[PDB]
């Protein structure tokens, strides 16, 4: 996947897939849906499914929630309060163990991020009255920092892959909806049907 600050964005349309098989699996660590009950995903359906995928730290899964604090929750990704979707997180320590130093996270920014804002930029952050130019020194910091994903780290430091799903309540003709079940057929019987 992509970086935590530059989260991967995917749009899904014109497909029919089951959502019950997701939570039924024995591999999902955290599965919290806010806009709808987890067991009623198959019953209902929406439009304009959006998927956000990234990797965060082990002890920061609680930051991804409507109306919370945190440096990552304010300078890397912030969920709007009026959010109708679900969040899935699972362990991926063996995928990044030696160990991983290609990950960067944002820590310094002038203001909090806007909802669903893809703020990608680089600049020497200023923390002093005097102007900053040339090379980084005092009050001149690099907003991105690396992860110490050492393989010998227990809970709280292992990388977790997080996928956030969002949907819209039918602003257009329906394109994606849950699969339906078809039974058998009979003959020479007084039968009512919908077909």
């Amino acid at each position, epitope marked *: 996947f992509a970086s935590v600050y530059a989260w991967n964005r995917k749009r899904i349309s014109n497909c029919v897939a089951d959502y019950s098989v997701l*939570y*039924n*699996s*024995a*591999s*999902f*660590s*955290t*599965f*919290k849906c806010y806009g709808v009950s*987890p067991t009623k995903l198959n019953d209902l359906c929406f439009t304009n499914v959006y998927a956000d995928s990234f990797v965060i730290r*082990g*002890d920061e899964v609680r930051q991804i929630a409507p109306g919370q604090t945190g440096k990552i929750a304010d300078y890397n990704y912030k969920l709007p309060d009026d959010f109708t979707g679900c969040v*899935i997180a*699972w362990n991926s320590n063996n995928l990044d163990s030696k160990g991983n130093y290609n990950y960067l996270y944002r820590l310094f920014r002038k203001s909090n991020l806007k909802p669903f804002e893809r703020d990608i930029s680089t600049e020497i952050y200023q923390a002093g009255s005097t102007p900053c130019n040339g090379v980084e020194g005092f009050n001149c910091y690099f907003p991105l920092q690396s992860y110490g994903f050492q393989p010998t780290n*227990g*809970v*709280g430091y292992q990388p977790y892959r997080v996928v956030v799903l969002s949907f819209e309540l039918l602003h257009a003709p329906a394109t994606v909806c849950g699969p339906k079940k078809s039974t058998n057929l009979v003959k020479n019987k007084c039968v009512n049907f919908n077909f």
Partner: antibody
Amino acid sequence: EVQLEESGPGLVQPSQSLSITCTVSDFSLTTYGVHWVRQSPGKGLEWLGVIWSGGSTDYNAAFISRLSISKDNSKSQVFFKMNSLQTNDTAIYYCARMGDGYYVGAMDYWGQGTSVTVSS
Amino acid sequence: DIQLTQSPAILSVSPGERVSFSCRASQSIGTSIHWYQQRTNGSPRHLIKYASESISGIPSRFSGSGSGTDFTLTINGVESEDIADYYCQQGHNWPLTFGAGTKLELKR
């Protein structure tokens, strides 16, 4: 006013399997996990496994291949099944809920366990 | 795996005096330690989490100190109700383990 209760004592022989029922009430199990810890006579507390509402199952290193944990939110019941009963399996098994915070810790309260007796 | 050693097996002291219980770890764990109190015919009760903050409903006499491999649970003016076995629990590694278990004994 949350409370946590388990099943009764077990009268088993070393050979077969057994199931332990852990039931929660007065709080939503769909938002917190469940921990299982055993305590043999003359031995300290040993954690067996933890189940999370997101369908996550974690087991101890020594009991990875001999444990089965199931959750049912319809009646808020946790089923703890183990196999390969041995003489040392005679112990007290505690079931408890998962607290908010970090993965290790967040131990607010617990529940009284069952006394399993294994003999020939 | 990691192991935890308690300070003394059984500590004898009168109620009302300063007491301290020690838990030692073979590997540095930062602050991922916890202290529990188990009484007779009773399961352990959580006293201190992370050796830095207390638990709601716990008397203020209980306190925690130390980091890394050494942790100390200190009680100001031990009372009769506090005469019980104590446990230290570690969770830095994936398999969480408990300490040997120190027992508090009355002196009178």
